[PDB]
Amino acid sequence: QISVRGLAGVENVTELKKNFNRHLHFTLVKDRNVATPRDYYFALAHTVRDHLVGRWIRTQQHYYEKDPKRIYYLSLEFYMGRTLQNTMVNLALENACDEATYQLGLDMEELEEIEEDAGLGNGGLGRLAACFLDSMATLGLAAYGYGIRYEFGIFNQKICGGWQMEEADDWLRYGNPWEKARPEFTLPVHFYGRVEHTSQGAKWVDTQVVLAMPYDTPVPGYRNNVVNTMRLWSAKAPNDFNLGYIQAVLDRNLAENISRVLYPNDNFFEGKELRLKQEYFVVAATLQDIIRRFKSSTNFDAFPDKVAIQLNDTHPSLAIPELMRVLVDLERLDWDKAWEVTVKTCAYTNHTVLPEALERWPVHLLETLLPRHLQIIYEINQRFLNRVAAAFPGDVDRLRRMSLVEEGAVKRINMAHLCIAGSHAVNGVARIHSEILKKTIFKDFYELEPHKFQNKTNGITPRRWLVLCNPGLAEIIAERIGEEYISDLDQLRKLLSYVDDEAFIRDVAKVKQENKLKFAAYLEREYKVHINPNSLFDVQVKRIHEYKRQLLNCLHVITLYNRIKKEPNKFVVPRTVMIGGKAAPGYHMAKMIIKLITAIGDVVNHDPVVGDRLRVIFLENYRVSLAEKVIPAADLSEQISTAGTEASGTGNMKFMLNGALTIGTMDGANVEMAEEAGEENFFIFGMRVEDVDRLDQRGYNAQEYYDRIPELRQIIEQLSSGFFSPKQPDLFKDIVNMLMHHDRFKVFADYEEYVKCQERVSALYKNPREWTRMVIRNIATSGKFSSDRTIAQYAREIWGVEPSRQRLPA
Amino acid sequence: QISVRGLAGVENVTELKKNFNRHLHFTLVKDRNVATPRDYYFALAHTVRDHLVGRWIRTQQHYYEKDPKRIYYLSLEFYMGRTLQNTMVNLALENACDEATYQLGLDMEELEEIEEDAGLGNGGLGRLAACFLDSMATLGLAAYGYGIRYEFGIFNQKICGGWQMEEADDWLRYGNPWEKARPEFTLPVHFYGRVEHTSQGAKWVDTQVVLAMPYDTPVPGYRNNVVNTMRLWSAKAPNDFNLGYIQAVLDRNLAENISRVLYPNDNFFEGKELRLKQEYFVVAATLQDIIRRFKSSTNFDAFPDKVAIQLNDTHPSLAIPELMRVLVDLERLDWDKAWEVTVKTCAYTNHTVLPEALERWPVHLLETLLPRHLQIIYEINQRFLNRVAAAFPGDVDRLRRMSLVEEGAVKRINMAHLCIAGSHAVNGVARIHSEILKKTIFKDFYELEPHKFQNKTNGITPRRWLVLCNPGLAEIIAERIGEEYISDLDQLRKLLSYVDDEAFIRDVAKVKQENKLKFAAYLEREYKVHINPNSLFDVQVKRIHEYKRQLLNCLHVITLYNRIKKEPNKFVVPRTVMIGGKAAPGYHMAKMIIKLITAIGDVVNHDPVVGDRLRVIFLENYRVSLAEKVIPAADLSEQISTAGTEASGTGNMKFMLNGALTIGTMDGANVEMAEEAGEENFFIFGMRVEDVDRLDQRGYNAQEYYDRIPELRQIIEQLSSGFFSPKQPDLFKDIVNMLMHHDRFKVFADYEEYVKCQERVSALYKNPREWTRMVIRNIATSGKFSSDRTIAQYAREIWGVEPSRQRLPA
Ligand SMILES: OC[C@H]1O[C@@H](NC(=S)N/N=C/c2ccc(Cl)cc2)[C@H](O)[C@@H](O)[C@@H]1O
Ligand SMILES: OC[C@H]1O[C@@H](NC(=S)N/N=C/c2ccc(Cl)cc2)[C@H](O)[C@@H](O)[C@@H]1O
Ligand SMILES: OC[C@H]1O[C@@H](NC(=S)N/N=C/c2ccc(Cl)cc2)[C@H](O)[C@@H](O)[C@@H]1O
Ligand SMILES: OC[C@H]1O[C@@H](NC(=S)N/N=C/c2ccc(Cl)cc2)[C@H](O)[C@@H](O)[C@@H]1O
């Protein structure tokens, strides 16, 4: 149908059809008489995956032959989503498969909905890893993603009586066609035990052993015939484990629990032993794999020339002492040489400045679980602090501030300090975030080693986040400027010369309308909820956190409702306000926020005076597959975190690429987005980081705002009195109390400017032509936020490798 | 190479080769450069399994169209062994695959050794189910095997310091190419809860739900294009199970533990809750499947016309009250009609008379786990006992003897009594066993309902147990009488006319010699143990039990050793005595017996005076795959259970078919074997059942034998004094004490006759021509012991269906 989806040749369509029938028969053991839609999906998945194998084998053979420097991206999260469409897009098979299935009497889009998301992540950090893998393959880098194959990913969110309920994400139930188990590359991982000191160095003994079994998943580059590997480890008990008899076999579950479930607590670091085990498990297994591949090329001087390890946050920080352990204890290198190798090999990416999210592991945990690693960490600390003492003589408080060991009630290890000490590069994920790192939380480290600190502004892959999810927009762009922009997003700048083009303006607006209609239909079919597709689609989708200020959005919604109720016969621009996202199961306040949103909806959506002028919908089970649907349908992107709290954001970039305007604070990547598009083409409001700091010095008093803003007072009165919860009058007392007395994120302080700015949004939306022209200016300047740019910067500035857009032979 | 292994056509060999390469590439994601022998096995397995799919789909479609009476064989055990060679044999693909792999530069026999046994059984009962499935497919019956997919089968046995060690049989580690998961046919199974009585009958409520997910495995008939299904259930937690958050997900293991491991305790009934859960799980899931298939044909009068359920022992006895529950509570049939249907549907096979093996479930267990079933069982009992009271008025002790409920310290349900009451047919597994059932343990039931009691003498499949494991013997037989005997084993009688044939005598003896050399080589390669291939191969392989009297064999071995030591320069027929088998992990005495055997070996095998005249080897990890190796190599089969204790035996039949002579008691099927071959061609010894009974009435005094047999006294003195355990003098005190004071199985009573009979064996072996002639007479009369005969008898006499040797179209 559309050009960017590839050719549907006679030979290819015929071959796809026969291989589809072959798989249905030989692979699924079905015939068309009893086959379900799910059987058809799997037949298609097997048909498509066949096209990956040759490229996958020869890419990996190519790396073995050419022996380039290898990039190892270590993460506890890879938020991949669905794989079928992405594979088709990257192999130019989409139209061919669409045709082939059509001729078989099947709707491919229907088959695509059957695939489970690989939800092996929580939000931004996990999704970033996924975009990064796509870009590394597209840029021809010898890159490997290493993580854990969780049996259960991020929970499925159900909403019951307005409350979030969690259920297990049993994503492997029907089997995963995109993985290949590699039980032959199974590796032992050690836990517990004790350290023996001998004549010939330290020895870690009496350990318990858990096996790490790898599963390989392909990562196809965009039409370059490159297929990289994401290798995920699964925990397996050894066969003599616990070996009355029956119990010993049943107890195998204990060892295998390591890879059972993804921790969903993105709000609050929990020092849970199982989480620590997960972190070491991925690190220990991965490093053996790295070293094996390096030896299959004695001399570890060349190790940093052939290996880069990127630590995605501090979660895999144990790579640093583990590498030291292997180099010193097993390979018998001297400390100083091992340390030089380690530092040159490792680099660390920070993803937050919120103190409660920082990993600070109790010493007693590390003492029991990883006794040798604790000793190594102590030695790292001593030698590091001796360097600090020499650079800043007599500065005793600096020494305690910079220590990897935190003294207190329980002694803790600061994993962020460990990462900085043992990495040659430390980066933040947006310019303002990287600056905040140097100025505040890691200031001491920056002063000691300024050369270590870099910025790498986040990006998103334009394959998933434009071509895949918004083919209509991709096509109207390709009609004017060609297809090259898909792997060179800066080319979107050429669209600036079409800002006055009447045909293009009409097409951009039409694509959005089509997307909105498609999404309005989805909501009715799958959730039986009805919306007005002519209203402004006002969306805030992201994990529920106080810092992200879904509550500020709630306050605006209630403001609009109250203004309508006051002047019912006055015209207002119709809005559909959509808020979605999961709360960490133990995050009470975030769970209360979800309940608030639904409670507002219950009042607003059933008020006859309101009509279809205002609708508030909670988007259930927000996940990658839902993002791919809602983002193309959005008109307004809510990016309203308190300045200095959102390290980057990536959702923001997805909305910008897909033709929504942004209302946001000058926080994270919003700053750079406004800079690229021009501040005139952005709806900026609220305190800057400097204003937040000023307010903190003075002391934040929420009562002041309550006293001076009558509309805000009304809302707080309504919440308190039980207007939004008639049968449980005091339901939202926790929310009110927090807002009034202990709001870390200054919701009230940005309220007036927010509401004012929202009025300017409604004003522009009344003028469809000018709304769309500003949209074109956003899309046209979204190029910088391609993860291809981000990865090219990591490659050149951190990893010391050059990207390549060159095809491998097919 | 050999004719019975099929044609190796040019077209087939070429096609097998290309499909092998296709699977290696697309399925295994490897190329020849990095492929391991295991990769090659899997490529071959996938290549062969492709040939099953068409036949499998059309067999099952055929049953749906023709709607024959369906046979459901319910067992907690299916001891399948390896599947690759069996599939090739039944599809006539063996020579073609041999050629195809040869041309690829691979040894197929080497690839075959890589396959794990499906060890989903303990011994005879489990293996019988497997032979039965093969015969039902070969005889064209619409048959389904239903059981549990254990994650861990029978433990792998390691011998360490002479002691049995158990390790987990992780048979699914590399994946199972012979199964197809069917998550679409997943069914709920209920546990716990309580019974509510309403106006409209009883209701079972507040249950916990465990999901049953089926996995289908093909059962190919012998060259008839029939492929039946063995459906095995796996336990899955529902997604809202236990749904702080992390624990709830981890607790899913509790529900899924149901299908985790096979109970190995074949010696002693353990009333463990997990085992009860397993038994109900298979029954509940299976019956829903049966009823679904029956409805997809309101009127349950026709149920017994379209359904037969065979209960393999009492393990699935809960099928009786479960069927009643469904018919009465869910379908709303009256009790009397439901009961008529149930009785006509169910049949029960008994496999033992040993009281400690009989399932007697504590009422308190059933009360908690299955409250509705207990109520149904009580009602069954009341109505049954009313029938007994009417037939035998005033006989009050009969009433308590026949009750399904046993009174005592803890009230128990006798599952065997439940099975007899609710089945239209009850059978033993050999003529003497079935007679013992009518005369002793079920005498009361026989008097009430004599028509219910039948015999179905056990059999073995001549496909696995001749063609597959002994191709050399199969071929020399086919050379004279054709190939028809393979599915009509009675044709082996034609070999009687070759008993004086000099060419045939020479060939039979040559095949045995070749088998012995092959096995002597296997022992050196895989276990580094050396044997004399010219010695008599004296083998006893079977689970270790006191009733099977491995101890009596031990006494003979020591007798031979002592006789050699007394007269060293006297000629004795050389023997390699091989004993193998697993002991249930909690069976102390059986574990002591294994240690005794190894301890004897340690003394005998290192005595220079003995030389190579006597060797004692413990065969480690006896299992189906090992049986296939050792049985063709055997000269003498030890079948020496105390008369009246071995219900049938099937190992005995395997040895008879493969050219070994039998030394045995008149127990189980040995009686019928001797009857078929002629007592002159069998080495029969020891007490008959009647002699055992006489001895019991008098009182068994082992001291009498010790006092009157000097050679026996010497052995007991040696055991006591520490001759076989120099550093632990009292090691075997338990064994001696048992033999002397509490031997239920009268080892001493058969000692003299046993030793005497063994002398006659050695005498015959000195005359190779006469040894072989007697062998021919055994093989020639082994026809009755084909499971084809057994299954045809079940079909006609119990199930009411006619077998068919007719091909389905290819
Ligand atoms: O889904 C059922 C099972 O499939 C298996 N896959 C096998 S046998 N081949 N895959 C080949 C392959 C080819 C191409 C690609 Cl792009 C990925 C895998 C998986 O190893 C196993 O984990 C899974 O449960
Ligand atoms: O850089 C990518 C994105 O990273 C995010 N960080 C996230 S998702 N941390 N999760 C941490 C976490 C901690 C513990 C657990 Cl158990 C789970 C998740 C930033 O908030 C966002 O601004 C940025 O764009
Ligand atoms: O081995 C990896 C996985 O394979 C899967 N098999 C699939 S996708 N097709 N099988 C088709 C098939 C065809 C013929 C026959 Cl005779 C048996 C199965 C199994 O369902 C799964 O349990 C297992 O782990
Ligand atoms: O008829 C086939 C064979 O059946 C055998 N019975 C067996 S293996 N019972 N296992 C029982 C059992 C009980 C509990 C558990 Cl957890 C495991 C096994 C007979 O002993 C044998 O004579 C006969 O030939």
The question of whether B543 is a catalytic residue gets the answer: yes
Q: Which residues contact A229 (CB under 8 A, 6 or more apart)?
A: A56, A60, A144, A145, A216, A217, A218, A219
Please judge whether B56 and A29 are an interchain contact, meaning their C-beta atoms are less than 8 angstroms apart. Answer: yes
Indicate if the alpha-carbon torsion angle B84, B85, B90, B92 is positive or negative. positive
- 8 A C-beta contact, residue A562 and residue A715: yes
> What residue of A is the nearest CA neighbor of B32?
A57
Six-digit token string for A288: 């053996």
Quote the DSSP letter at residue B614: E
Beta strands in B29-107 (DSSP E): 70-74, 78-81
- Please state whether beta strands B575-580 and B536-541 pair in parallel, antiparallel, or not at all (unpaired): parallel
Does residue A393 sit in the same domain as residue A405? Answer: yes
Whether B74 contacts B318, CB under 8 Å:
no
Sign of torsion, CA B120 B124 B129 B134? positive
Whether residues B432 and B489 fall in one domain: no
Alpha helices in B567-701 (DSSP H): 588-604, 624-633, 651-657, 670-677, 689-698
B29 neighbors A53 (Cβ within 8 angstroms):
yes
Measured between alpha carbons, how far is B136 from B805 in angstroms, rounded to an integer? 11
A275 and A382, same domain (yes or no): yes
Reading the block at residue A378, the tokens are 């102590």
- Cβ neighbours for B380, distance < 8 A, ≥ 6 positions apart: B320, B321, B324, B339, B404, B418, B421, B422
Residues 6+ apart with CB under 8 A from A277: A191, A258, A369
Q: Determine if residue A750 is labeled as part of a ligand binding site.
A: no
Q: Is B598 a catalytic residue?
A: no
The CA A31 to ligand 1 mean position distance, Å, reads 22
User: Which of A34, A50, A154, A249 should one mutate to test binding to chain B, selecting the residue with the greatest count of B CBs within 10 A?
Assistant: A249
How far apart, in whole angstroms, are the C-alpha atoms of residue A485 and residue A461?
Answer: 12
| Same domain as B649, residue B633 | yes
CB contact A173 to B (< 8 Å) = yes
Q: Are residues B796 and B753 in the same domain?
A: no
Q: Do the Cβ atoms of A173 and B236 come within 8 Å?
A: yes
Q: Which residues contact A116 (CB under 8 A, 6 or more apart)?
A: A82, A171, A174
Q: How many CA atoms lie within 13 A of B613 on its CB side?
A: 19
> CA triplet B737, B739, B743: central angle to 5 degrees?
110
The continuous run of DSSP H or E covering A72 comes out as strand A70-74
Which is nearest to B239 in space by CA: A175, A155, A250? A155
Instruction: List phi, psi (to 5°) of A453.
Output: -90, 125
What the block records as the tokens of A285 is 């297994």
In terms of CA atoms, which chain A residue is nearest residue B245? A585
Give SS3 for A353. coil
Same domain, B243 and B96: yes
Of A108, A133, A101, the residue nearest A16 (C-alpha): A101
Buried-state track A679-691, b at ≥16 Cβ within 10 A, e below 16: eebbbbbbbbbeb
- Atom index in ligand 4 nearest the CA of residue B127 equals 2
Provide the token pair at B315.
Answer: 């393990």
Radius of gyration of chain A (CA): 27
Which of B424, B543, B575, B595 does the annotation list as catalytic?
A: B543
The reported resolution of this PDB entry, expressed in Å, is 2.0
- How far apart are the CA of B301 and the nearest CA of chain A, in angstroms? 29
Residue type, A180: K
Do B548 and B648 contact (CB within 8 A), yes or no?
no
Cα four-point dihedral sign A411, A414, A419, A421: negative
Say if CB B448 and CB B401 are below 8 A apart.
no
Which three-class secondary structure string do you get for A275-342?
Answer: HHHHHHHHHHHHHHHHHHHHHCCCCHHHHHHHEEEEEECCCCCCHHHHHHHHHHHHCCCCHHHHHHHH
Out of B351, B372, B412, B556, the active site residue is B351
| Listed residue (A276, A305, A311, A261) closest to A152, CA to CA | A261
Q: Residue A352: CB within 6 Å of ligand 2? A: yes
Are B528 and B455 within one domain? no
Question: Same domain, yes or no, for B23 and B49?
Answer: yes
Q: Are A469 and A629 in contact, with CB atoms under 8 Å apart? A: yes
Give the rounded distance of the alpha carbon of A275 from its chain centre: 19
* Positive or negative: CA dihedral B669, B670, B673, B674: negative
Task: Answer for the pair A349, A427: CB distance below 8 angstroms, yes or no.
Answer: yes
Show Cβ contacts of residue B293 under 8 Å, excluding neighbours closer than 6 positions. Answer: B70
Query: Do B608 and B683 belong to one domain?
Result: yes
Output the six-digit token pair for B181.
């998961």
The phi and psi torsions of B407 (rounded to 5 degrees) equal -80, 155
User: By alpha-carbon position, which residue is closest to atom 5 of ligand 1?
Assistant: A180
φ and ψ at residue A584, rounded to 5 degrees: -60, 135
Tell how many helices (H) and how many strands (E) occur in chain A: 32, 25
Q: Which amino acid appears at position A479 of this protein?
A: E
Contacts with B56 from chain A: Cβ below 8 Å: 29
Is the minimum CB–CB distance between A247 and chain B shorter than 8 Å? Answer: no
Whole-angstrom distance, CA of residue A755 vs CA of residue A552? 10
| Location of structure tokens 């640093």 | A320
Give the angle A273-A275-A279 at the CA atoms, nearest 5°.
115
Note whether A663 and A757 are within 8 A (CB): yes
Looking at this protein, which amino acid is placed at residue A452? Answer: K
Helix (H) or strand (E) run with residue A189 in it: strand A187-191
A277 touches A191 (CB < 8 A): yes
Angle (nearest 5°) at CA B767 between B763 and B769: 140
* Nearest one of A476, A609, A319 to A3, comparing CA atoms: A476
Q: Which two tokens stand for residue A718?
A: 């309504």
Looking at the CA of A432, which ligand is closest? 2
**Chain centroid to CA B466: how far?**
17
Are residue A356 and residue A429 in the same domain, yes or no?
A: yes
- CB A29 less than 6 A from any atom of ligand 3: yes
Q: What's the token pair of residue A594?
A: 């979800």
- Nearest CA, atom 22, ligand 1: A181
CA of B777 to the centre of ligand 2 (A): 79
Same domain? A698 vs A725:
yes
Residue type, B621: N
Distance between the two ends of chain A, CA-based, in angstroms? 25
Strands B636-639 and A187-191: unpaired
Peptide-bond breaks in chain B following residues (C–N over 2.5 A): 243, 297
The tokens of B691 are what? 């002699």
Q: How far apart are the C-alpha atoms of B237 and A261, rounded to whole Å? A: 15
Residue A741's Cα: distance from chain center in Å?
32
CA atoms within 13 A on the CB side of A84: 23
- Contact yes or no for B537/B636 (Cβ under 8 A): yes
Which residues touch A451 (CB under 8 Å, ≥6 apart)?
none
Distance A675 CA to ligand 2 centre (A): 24
SS3 content of chain B, % helix, strand, coil (to 5): 55, 15, 30
Which ligand has the nearest atom to the CA of A670?
Answer: 2
Rounded alpha-carbon distances, angstroms, from residue B245 to A356, A444, A580, B252, B257: 20, 38, 21, 12, 20
Tokens 């031990």, residue located:
B554
CB A59 within 8 A of CB A220: no
Q: Residue A28 in contact with residue A42, Cβ under 8 Å?
A: yes
| Residues 6+ away with beta carbon under 8 Å from B504 | B476, B480, B495, B498, B776
Q: Would an 8 Å CB–CB cutoff place A251 in contact with chain B? A: no
CA of A579 to the centre of ligand 2 (A): 19
From the CA of A54, how many Å to the nearest CA of chain B?
8
- Taking only residues 549 to 588 of chain A, the set having a beta carbon closer than 8 angstroms to any beta carbon of chain B reads 585-586
Query: 3-state SS of chain A: helix, strand, coil percent to 5?
Result: 55, 15, 30
Specify the amino acid at residue B680.
E
Q: Which residue has the tokens 């062998």?
A: B775
Cβ atoms of A359 and A315 within 8 Å: the answer is yes
Distance CA A127, CA A681 (A): 27
Whole-angstrom distance, CA of residue B155 vs CA of residue A746 = 63
* Bridge partners, residue A538, by sequence: A577, A636
User: DSSP per residue over B438-490, as a string?
Assistant: IIIITHHHHHH-GGGEEE----B-TIIIIIIT-HHHHHHHHHHH-SGGGG-GG
Q: Render A444-469 in DSSP notation, one character per residue.
A: HHHHH-GGGEEE----B-TIIIIIIT
In whole angstroms, what is the distance from residue B590 CA to residue B582 CA?
9
User: In sequence order, what are the residues at sequence separation of 6 or more whose Cβ sits closer than 8 angstroms to the Cβ of residue B126?
Assistant: B75, B77, B78, B79, B120
Do residues A635 and A661 touch, judged by C-beta distance below 8 A?
Answer: yes
How many A×B Cβ pairs under 8 Å?
A: 107
What Å distances lie between residue B420 and B1, B345, B446, CA to CA?
51, 13, 10
With beta carbons under 8 A apart, name residues in chain A contacting B184. Answer: 36, 38
For residue B791, report the distance from its CA to the centre of ligand 1, in Å.
39
Q: What does the DSSP assignment read for B312-344?
A: ESSTTTTHHHHHHHIIIIIS---HHHHHHHHHH
Residue B252 Cβ < 6 Å to ligand 3:
no
Residue whose CA is at the smallest distance from ligand 4 atom 2: B125
d(CA A774, CA B572) in angstroms, rounded, equals 105
Give the amino acid at B105.
Answer: G
Q: Do the beta carbons of residue B132 and residue B104 sit within 8 Å? A: no
Q: Which residue, A524, A525, A540, is CA-closest to A580?
A: A540
Q: Flag whether B292 is marked binding.
A: yes
Q: Are A308 and A70 in contact (CB under 8 A)?
A: yes
| CA A798/CA A23 separation, integer angstroms | 44
Q: Are A409 and A362 in contact (CB under 8 A)?
A: no
CA distance B53 to B61: 12
Which residue CA neighbors atom 21 of ligand 2 most closely?
A649
- A245 to chain B, closest Cα gap in Å: 7
Q: Which two tokens stand for residue A235?
A: 């925990």
Burial class (CB in 10 A: 0-12, 13-18, 19+), B206: exposed
Half-sphere exposure of A571 toward its Cβ, with a 13 Å CA cutoff? 5
Closest CA of chain A from B585, distance in Å: 7
Catalytic residue among B51, B575, B654, B746: B654
Among A650, A662, A665, A790, the active-site one is A650
Quote the tokens at residue A396: 């005793």
Determine the Cα–Cα distance for residues A236 and A233; give it in Å rounded to an integer.
10
Comparing CA positions, the residue from B191, B189, B178 lying closest to residue B217 is: B178
C-beta atoms of A167 and B240 within 8 A: yes
- Is the Cα dihedral B287, B293, B299, B301 positive or negative? negative
Amino acid found at A526: E
CB contact under 8 A, A585 and B244: yes
Domain hosting residue B645, numbered range: 460-786
A709 class by beta-carbon count within 10 Å (0-12 exposed, 13-18 middle, 19+ buried): middle
Helix (H) or strand (E) holding B663: strand B661-664
CB B415 within 8 A of CB B360: yes
CATH number at residue A22: 3.40.50.2000
Q: Is the CB of B125 under 6 A from ligand 4?
A: yes
* Catalytic-residue membership of A351: yes
Q: How far is the CA of B403 from the centre of ligand 4 (A)?
A: 24
Number of domains in chain B: 2
CB B180 within 8 A of CB B215: yes
* Residue A370 sits in the same domain as residue A478: no
SS3 sequence of A501-530? CHHHHHHHHHHHHHHHHHHHHHHHHHHCCC
With beta carbons less than 8 A apart as the criterion, state whether A195 and A369 touch. no
d(CA B471, CA B629): 12
